[PDB]
Design a protein around this ligand. Structure first.
Ligand SMILES: *[C@@H]1O[C@H](CO)[C@@H](O[C@@H]2O[C@H](CO)[C@@H](O[C@@H]3O[C@H](CO)[C@@H](O)[C@H](O)[C@@H]3O)[C@H](O)[C@H]2NC(C)=O)[C@H](O)[C@H]1NC(C)=O
Ligand SMILES: *[C@@H]1O[C@H](CO)[C@@H](O[C@@H]2O[C@H](CO)[C@@H](O[C@@H]3O[C@H](CO)[C@@H](O)[C@H](O)[C@@H]3O)[C@H](O)[C@H]2NC(C)=O)[C@H](O)[C@H]1NC(C)=O
Ligand SMILES: *[C@@H]1O[C@H](CO)[C@@H](O[C@@H]2O[C@H](CO)[C@@H](O[C@@H]3O[C@H](CO)[C@@H](O)[C@H](O)[C@@H]3O)[C@H](O)[C@H]2NC(C)=O)[C@H](O)[C@H]1NC(C)=O
Ligand SMILES: *[C@@H]1O[C@H](CO)[C@@H](O[C@@H]2O[C@H](CO)[C@@H](O)[C@H](O)[C@H]2NC(C)=O)[C@H](O)[C@H]1NC(C)=O
Ligand SMILES: *[C@@H]1O[C@H](CO)[C@@H](O[C@@H]2O[C@H](CO)[C@@H](O)[C@H](O)[C@H]2NC(C)=O)[C@H](O)[C@H]1NC(C)=O
Ligand SMILES: *[C@@H]1O[C@H](CO)[C@@H](O[C@@H]2O[C@H](CO)[C@@H](O)[C@H](O)[C@H]2NC(C)=O)[C@H](O)[C@H]1NC(C)=O
Ligand code: NAG
Lengths: 570, 188, 96, 91, 192
């Protein structure tokens, strides 16, 4: 309800639905004050200071969430006093922003501010007193952000019920050993975007019930061996962008409740200590990407059977130990891409059976043992792209019948038409290849490969293929036989060396089935016997086959050099 | 990784290894008997044509099978099954399936002397009658299933059993469910 | 009739192309093909539960393997191939 | 779990049935040997009706044509002439 | 297509300011220092469906201001500063206007023929006008509306014949008024 007798007041009530704006200096807009139906107020002094020295009252009553933005304060005064005119009652959250004035804090400021859960000070508190928070009755949360703050030990003396103390861009330079003393029941601690130098083992003394710690940006150079000993209840630790070069041995051997551990961007980190993650039965998601780890201890993950996902991408690791994956039969998603990995030890993966997806891309792989995938009965994706695999084993996919999607883009694989499925002794109606064995394969990406041929099994054994990427191949020509997939498939033969397309007029697919084939950037001969193909392109109405044949142009017949199909006269 | 330790031509029983499953067959041409063996989990013992003996066959060292399967194979009178299949060396087994098409026999606890840690079980045919307790309360008999048997039971024949998380009957031909037949199925 | 909508399909052998020959050639080789025969279900593209039998069922596609093994002529290691071909499409009862 | 049950076999065939009908002395020499997975239908179930359903259908047995060097003892002499062989059982 | 002037420092309105744009349908003025107008300022904007002027110190308006535009669907006049009066027949014969808001305007007098000829109105607000009296008793001549707010006004008496035209009027507000008594005949037509 807007303020009656508005003529006397300078303020103006806009009386929107569920709002009530205000611009109390009516001549010059300032103190944009609204009210979200007594659920939330807001207050912004953006224009000019001290404009509320003698403001008329607004009689807001009680409201849950207050918010003050960029407004000046009177130092020796409790906050509500400084805004007495608002007449708020029972604040339940008090978000403050102060882009302009850095103000020292103390207890007096929050007098009358109790019964408050979500406190927050963005740029508000330049420095904090030891007695500031003592007044509070119960304070569920807290957060100080985007300010350079100096912390004295035990400032959080009596915030027993506190939860999720959050410091972002606070940039404290070092955690005092007694900084957190007297504090309990924290379901969250934030040290992200902080300037911490190291972590003394006493720096976490007070905390007992902590369940989640975050270090998204930290300058910590070293840990103490028992830094995380007191954190017995801990359940998740995140470290990102940390310049530590190495870890102390057995650092986490105490945090048995731990669930998820993530280390990312430790470009200086080079060697994990032995048994770092041993015996954490609870652990379920470990990520160690983007580090500079060079070589993995064999017993990194001894006894830590509870893992579901593991991720080691972007490292500089070069060679791997089989013992690392020996006792994690629950694992589901592995990753090793972008390593300088050279060759998978043959029996590396024979222990796991649950492994859904596997990644190996961007390595220096050369070859794979048939035994590599002998046991992955539930695998469903695979990424061998960007690997120097000149040759593959014929009996590779024997044990992975549920494989769906496989990608070998930018590979060095060169399996020829024959000599991939035959020894000139036994003729096979369907080529015997690893791809043939995976019947449930659907999406495949052999683009940039040099096989230069299409396998009969691809369209005999692999009934449900939907996406074929045969781009950048050396294939001499395309035959109608080599495209009787029948099932909806996308065929890409662009940038290939294909020059001869052979069709027969009686060509007809199953009704309602449409395949798209692309032949752009190919040196396509245009002499006779390509005629039926020109008929299927030019003067074509509708059929199963489509042809993204825009950029194609006749190469060799000199009279018609570079003339596109539509240009051409039969 | 056994790969037919004994020489082939001695018993003419030849086998081939692969990554998937080192198959086996004895007659070497038109084979009557087939021992499919998954390297770790499955075992498939099949004798669709009658087998002369279980001694001339070699001894395929297999540690343990997470699953076993016998197909159309005669079972020895009053022996443990593995005792009958002594040549087929398998120690630890958890599941089981049995599908004897021909020459059904009555059952006992003797036929299961060395197979008392069976999580599952199945007797797809050839089940004349289960005279005494299927298991002497053998551990964690989570499931059980007898089918196409054309048999007749006794009440509370199963009472020794307790942990039968599942019991399955198909094509039993059984005329009437005698009272208390499901007596012991405390945790069914 | 049959429980599943299985349709015979002929597959032509892969044709060797004489792309060396810029001149046209007889399509007589293209005209006759020895070919091979396979079988597949189009039952909702092999999705039918085999309707007129009411038991819990779903039609499956089944394959067969041909094992041709010859010791090499150069007396190299014995060469064995197991070509796989879709051979039948059959219906199977399933649990709940 | 199957309305029709088929015994699996490996045959290594000689003089197998064919289209031309002139395929005798097929090659199964110990060095040149060819075998073919087949699904023989159970003898007693050839005409007895399929189970797990009320279908009046019997478990009939199909046939299919496979590529084998059965025409001559020498291998590759017929270029794998198609031989007739048993296939699965369908009601 | 759309033009808005919010928190602008412009202190004046020219007639030729808005020329070169027949197809304009939206005009917003949330805050401005404009104190002058002209009936031809918006003339070129025949298709201007919405005109919103707020937080402006203009003391008065020119005759025939919004009369030229017959396509004006909505008009808003909120938080006006020292607006002593309103021109007669500003909205005469609009025929399209559906909602007119004059809330927070310090007007001491009301015109009977200001809204005459607008047969589209469904909402009309005069909130916080603080009219010393209500001279206009012939505003019901566009009875098609259903809502009305005359709250925070100093009018001493409500005219008996003021409400004899409308029957579809759904909602009414008269709070914070100087009403000694209510007419015995005026409420007999407010069936809805
Ligand atoms: C491949 O994808 C195409 C989509 O481009 C699928 O086409 C669809 O095919 C079904 C039947 O094959 C069509 O249903 C038909 O609808 C008509 C009524 O229009 C009805 O009379 C028929 O009895 C039948 O139910 C459907 O309209 C059609 N949709 C489109 C957009 O073409 C095709 O089924 C896919 N094939 C495979 C093998 O995945
Ligand atoms: C003895 O037979 C039982 C058959 O029930 C085997 O246990 C069951 O194995 C199936 C695998 O087909 C499991 O099904 C999968 O289970 C997961 C988890 O519940 C579910 O998310 C999947 O959707 C799917 O249903 C099933 O859970 C499992 N247990 C039971 C009670 O059915 C058991 O492995 C056999 N024992 C041996 C030694 O082979
Ligand atoms: C059904 O399941 C229950 C529980 O899974 C089985 O009871 C278990 O029987 C075994 C066999 O004696 C007990 O193992 C024994 O435990 C004692 C104490 O730890 C130990 O000293 C012995 O050496 C032996 O290991 C096991 O404790 C017992 N568990 C429970 C909860 O009672 C039962 O046998 C299963 N089968 C039937 C038919 O009930
Ligand atoms: C204090 O902050 C918490 C954190 O947002 C608020 O809890 C949220 O309440 C909304 C309202 O339904 C939920 O949608 C969120 O999921 C809650 N988040 C959490 C982490 O609990 C809480 O309402 C705030 N309390 C006050 C008084 O402001
Ligand atoms: C922490 O919260 C608890 C309750 O959540 C508070 O406990 C109450 O404390 C008052 C006086 O401090 C007692 O009169 C009540 O009986 C207590 N109730 C319960 C349920 O404990 C406690 O005071 C809070 N303490 C701090 C430091 O926030
Ligand atoms: C096809 O694959 C080759 C081999 O992966 C790619 O060549 C590489 O290109 C990257 C990026 O320029 C270089 O860093 C490597 O040194 C190249 N390797 C070799 C051996 O040449 C090639 O770029 C790919 N072409 C595409 C993308 O179609
Ligand atoms: C086919 O591949 C070429 C090169 O890889 C690409 O330019 C083209 O867009 C692809 N076509 C489709 C339909 O993706």
């Amino acid at each position: 309800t807007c303020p009656e007798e508005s003529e006397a007041s300078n303020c103006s009530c806009e009386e929107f639905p569920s709002k009530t704006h205000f611009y109390c200096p009516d001549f010059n807009p300032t103190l944009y004050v609204d009210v979200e139906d007594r659920m939330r107020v807001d207050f912004k002094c953006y224009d000019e200071p001290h404009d509320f020295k003698s403001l008329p009252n607004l009689a807001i009553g009680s409201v849950k969430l207050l918010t003050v933005v960029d407004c000046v304060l009177d130092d020796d005064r409790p906050i509500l006093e400084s805004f007495k005119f608002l007449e708020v009652a029972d604040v339940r959250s008090f978000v403050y922003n102060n882009h302009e004035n850095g103000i020292r804090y103390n207890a007096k400021y929050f007098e009358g501010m109790e019964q408050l859960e979500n406190l927050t000070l963005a740029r508000g508190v330049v420095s904090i007193d030891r007695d500031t928070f003592s007044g509070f009755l119960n304070l569920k949360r807290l957060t100080i952000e985007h300010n350079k703050l100096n912390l004295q030990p035990g400032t959080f003396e009596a915030l027993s019920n506190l939860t999720y103390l959050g410091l972002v861009y606070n940039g404290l330079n070092e955690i005092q050993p007694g900084l957190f003393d007297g504090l309990e029941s924290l379901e969250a601690l934030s040290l992200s975007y902080n300037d911490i130098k190291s972590l003394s083992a006493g720096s976490f003394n007070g905390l007992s019930s902590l369940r989640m710690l975050n270090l998204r940006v930290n300058k910590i150079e070293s840990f103490d061996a028992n830094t995380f000993a007191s954190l017995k209840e801990l359940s998740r630790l995140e470290i990102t962008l940390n310049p530590f070069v190495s870890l102390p041995r057995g650092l986490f051997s105490e945090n048995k409740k731990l669930k998820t551990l993530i280390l990312t961007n430790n470009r200086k980190l080079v060697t994990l200590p032995e048994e770092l993650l041993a015996n954490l039965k609870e652990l379920t998601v470990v990520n160690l990407s983007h580090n500079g780890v060079g070589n993995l201890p064999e017993s990194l993950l001894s006894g830590s059977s509870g893992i579901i996902e593991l991720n080691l991408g972007y490292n500089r690791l070069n060679s791997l130990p089989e013992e690392l994956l020996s006792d994690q039969p629950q694992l589901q998603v592995l990753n090793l891409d972008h390593n300088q990995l050279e060759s998978i030890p043959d029996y590396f993966l024979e222990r796991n059976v649950e492994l859904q997806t596997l990644y190996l891309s961007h390595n220096r792989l050369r070859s794979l043992s048939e035994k590599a995938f002998t046991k992955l009965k539930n695998l469903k994706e695979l990424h061998l792209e960007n690997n120097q695999l000149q040759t593959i084993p014929q009996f590779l996919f024997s044990g992975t019948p549920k494989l769906e999607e496989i990608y070998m883009q930018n590979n060095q694989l060169a399996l020829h038409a024959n000599s991939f499925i035959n020894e000139e002794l036994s003729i096979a109606d369907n080529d015997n290849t690893p791809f043939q064995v995976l019947q449930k394969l659907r999406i495949l990406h052999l683009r940039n490969n040099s096989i230069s041929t299409i396998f009969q099994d691809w369209y005999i054994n692999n009934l449900e293929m939907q996406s074929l990427d045969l781009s950048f191949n050396k294939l001499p020509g395309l035959s109608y036989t080599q495209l009787q997939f029948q099932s909806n498939i996308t065929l890409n033969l662009s940038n290939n060396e294909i020059s001869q397309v052979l069709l027969i007029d009686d060509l007809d697919l199953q009704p309602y089935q449409r395949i798209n084939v692309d032949l752009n950037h190919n040196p396509l001969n245009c002499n006779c016997n390509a005629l039926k193909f020109i008929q299927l392109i030019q003067s074509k109405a509708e059929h199963g086959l489509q042809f993204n044949v825009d950029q194609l142009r006749c190469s060799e017949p000199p009279n018609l050099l570079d003339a596109t199909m539509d240009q051409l006269q039969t | 990784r056994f790969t037919c330790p004994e020489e082939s031509e001695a018993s003419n029983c030849s086998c081939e290894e692969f990554p998937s499953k080192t198959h086996f067959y004895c007659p070497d041409f038109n084979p009557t008997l087939y021992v499919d063996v998954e390297d770790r989990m499955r075992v498939d013992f099949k004798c669709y044509d009658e087998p002369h003996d279980f001694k001339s066959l070699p001894n395929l060292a297999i540690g343990s099978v997470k699953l076993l399967t016998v197909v159309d194979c005669v079972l020895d009178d009053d022996r443990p099954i593995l005792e009958s299949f002594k040549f087929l060396e398998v120690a630890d087994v958890r599941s089981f399936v049995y599908n004897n098409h021909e020459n059904g026999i009555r059952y006992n606890a003797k036929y299961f002397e060395g197979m008392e840690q069976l999580e599952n079980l199945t007797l797809a045919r050839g089940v004349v009658s289960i005279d005494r307790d299927t298991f002497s309360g053998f551990l964690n008999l989570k499931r059980l299933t007898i089918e196409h048997n054309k048999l007749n039971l006794q009440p509370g024949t199963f009472e020794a059993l307790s942990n039968l998380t599942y019991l399955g009957l198909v094509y039993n031909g059984l005329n009437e469910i005698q009272p208390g037949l499901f007596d012991g199925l405390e945790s069914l | 009739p049959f429980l599943c909508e299985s349709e015979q399909l002929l597959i032509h052998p892969k044709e060797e192309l004489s792309r060396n020959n810029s001149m046209v050639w007889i399509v007589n080789t293209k005209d006759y093909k020895q070919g091979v025969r396979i079988e597949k279900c189009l039952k909702r593209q092999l999705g039918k539960p085999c309707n007129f039998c009411d038991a819990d069922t779903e039609c499956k596609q089944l394959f067969h393997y041909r094992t041709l093994v010859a010791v090499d002529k150069v007396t190299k290691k014995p060469y064995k191939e197991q070509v796989l071909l879709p051979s039948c499409c059959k219906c199977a009862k399933i649990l709940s």
